RNA sequence: AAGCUUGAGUCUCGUAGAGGGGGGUAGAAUUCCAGGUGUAGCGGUGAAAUGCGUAGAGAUCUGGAGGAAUACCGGUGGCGAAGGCGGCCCCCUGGACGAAGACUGACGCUCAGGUGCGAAAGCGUGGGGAGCAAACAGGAUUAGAUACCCUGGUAGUCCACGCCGUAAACGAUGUCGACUUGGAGGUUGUGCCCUUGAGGCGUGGCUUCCGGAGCUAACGCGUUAAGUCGACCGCCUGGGGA
């Protein structure tokens, strides 16, 4: 699975004591951490596709959550895209 | 998965009679209460009770005397693909006059005779025998 | 892959390319080279003695250590190359403190490999351990029959030879021809299998290349006049008569071994 | 750190190869703070069937508790010897002493 | 005791033909028979058993 | 345009898997090859022949090479969206399930046209080649035998990077949820108990053989329904001809 070095260490930037997992804004940063974890599973074991089928769901969950946050509040959407790498 | 809470109310009326239950329980709503209100007043159920402060459950009370059912037909009529509307004099007769129809109106849920008393038409939301 | 050229012309529509980033394609080290000079398939008196050989351009001799010995002095592959006088690859080896030499490369694509000289060495490809000291079933790479002749068989691209048995002063070994033979177990061998195996993968698809590939086009004995080849024809598409050599002999299916010296070591011939 | 037995056979007529690896192994595992619970020698033991006419083990086990990238030094050093058979790491199932 | 890697314990769960015994004599209370039948096959690769008695 | 917490989402920490894919490790025999060794049989069958052998078969003994697939375990026992998945060992890795908390607040279902998975056999390109085996090559049988059956055997089976997209893909059962009297047998979390119990009583997730209400032309389905009440997408209208 995704390492605890991505699911506990996120409370260094999106908090200071405890996590806020239903916030939409944390789920976009979590799905980016899944993408960075499963891109580590590339170029090796190349006839196994379940992580790539899972990534095809993660990339669209990430886009939908970003759009839904912009519809909820443009200020909380702006607050998110300034703390993401964005556009490669 | 689950779209129609009134189809999911009419199930309860059949399921409980098939098990000879003195009372039957379901997820509660302001509309399912507005229908239970009529089911008591038209003499089909003896009472209704809602219990729960954040997740209310609706309990409907039945009475038997012969070991048999008390409502042998109940139908949802208007459904999401085909709702049926009727005007104040074209209001429908059920089972050649041996049943009654329920109307949503522009005010709230009542029978076809209470609608024809006020002068109202509207959506025909249930038949009961 | 093995990548194929896009169709644009004859013969390039058939051409394939294969690459090795660790192969050195540049000119050889000059202190290990002799001129050779082509004989043109012609003898000392200047007359033809072998047909369709020795044309084109300059083709030198690499000084190869086919009699390589030493003990306790390992060597490293400094460079990996090819040579147009043969089909397999050549490795330039540098010994522990000095001196550059050549050896015939085992299977694999890279340089930097370390190989041992000695009898007490490990069972690793390229080591000089005699056929007396191998576990049997091993592959012997380039094989030696006499120490004053050196590594004399299994030298071509993709070649291999397995040992069958050890008995008396000898080992019994297989061959790519089906030849079954015994050889003295004190001979050094070279250990492993021969590399390259791509010398046939050439396409070219142009008939002008004969000269730069060291040869010239042959003319048919049935197409030339009956004075210069005993086929004589005919007339084209009118072969008429049974096949023979340009020298009047029946050889298709007719055997020509008669040395009287070596069948004493060879139990079964070509199959 | 993950639990591992680190167990290897070695033929008793070849037992001179064991101090030629285990004295380097124990210093590598103490450099990784590994517990080395057992470090036990079983005298001489038989195999379940003879293999290339060798049927006997010197049989030693360490039980290390050690990192995945430290047992890689053991894996590659048993593979470097090759004449040693059934060099196994036998993961997990917690630590063992006296084995009941 | 209590583990399959000891031959004086292991020999009580197998036959003189190399086969595995019925649950009625394994002491697994019919609830660990599946896992014990795999632990016995794992003992072949631990050099405790041959892979078949006929070889 | 603002709310609600049941279905749904996600996390530190755990639970069981032949789900997916590597790198090590392993046994035997059909075969190819060199000795040990004994004598004319072996092989097939209703009988024989082709074939294997007499230049020493098959049997039996040693040494070596070659490669698919993993016997038993193994099943009404797990896992996957299906196809299917299987020696062991150590890895890489999606999903699912759990307990206490927390954070969301309808995020729930299906889907025109799109966009994507292969059992086996086949192809595109080169390797690898022990069984086996279309074709090929012979024998037998029969009046005949371009077949059955027997004796040899090429493609292929295997590995990489792509194509093929089809099957009893069958449990002949399209897909989401809720509701429901029973018997008998398993698989795996979790809570409380001297587990003073061959565990027990609760609580979660799965799974198999029977059986009653229900369904139905009758067979078949039966709480994992072909039942019951609802939401959605495709196709059919006698067959031949197609």
Question: What does this protein structure show overall?
Answer:
It is classed as ribosome. The entry lists the keywords cryo-EM refinement, tRNA, translocation intermediate, ribosome. The entry is titled "E. coli 70S-fMetVal-tRNAVal-tRNAfMet complex in hybrid pre-translocation state (pre4)". This is part of a larger assembly, with chains A (88 residues), B (129 residues), C (271 residues), D (100 residues) and E (55 residues). Chain A has 88 residues and is mainly alpha-helical. Helices cover 56% and strands 0% of the residues of chain A. Chain A has one domain. Chain A is built from four helices and no strands. Chain A is globular, with a radius of gyration of 14 Å. In chain C, a hairpin with a 4-residue loop joins strand 6 and strand 7. Chain D is α+β, with helices and mostly antiparallel strands. In chain D, the strands form two sheets. Chain D has a three-stranded antiparallel beta sheet with strand order 1-5-2, with no helix packed on it. Chain D has a two-stranded antiparallel sheet with strand order 3-4. The longest helix of chain D has 14 residues. Classes of the chains: A mainly alpha (88), B alpha+beta (129), C mainly beta (271), D alpha+beta (100), E mainly alpha (55). Chains in contact: D-E. The structure holds one RNA strand of 242 nucleotides.
> How many independent structural domains of chain B?
2
Strand order of the largest sheet of chain C: 7-6-5-8
Q: Helical segment tally of chain B?
A: 3
By CATH reckoning, the class of the largest domain in chain B would read Alpha Beta
Provide the β-strand percentage band of chain C: 15-25%
Class per helix and strand makeup of chain B = alpha+beta
The proportion of strand residues of chain B reads 15-25%
Could you say what the CATH architecture of the largest domain in chain B is? 2-Layer Sandwich
Number of strands of chain B: 8
Which two chains have the most extensive interface, and how many residues on each? D-E, 9 and 11 residues
Determine Rg of chain B (CA atoms, Å): 15 Å
Helix and strand sequence of chain B:
HEHEEEEEEHE
Assembly state of the chains shown: part of a larger assembly
Number of strands of chain C: 14
Share of residues in helices of chain C? under 10%
Structural class of chain C: mainly beta
PDB class: ribosome
Keywords: cryo-EM refinement, tRNA, translocation intermediate, ribosome
Entry title: E. coli 70S-fMetVal-tRNAVal-tRNAfMet complex in hybrid pre-translocation state (pre4)
Chain A: 30S ribosomal protein S15
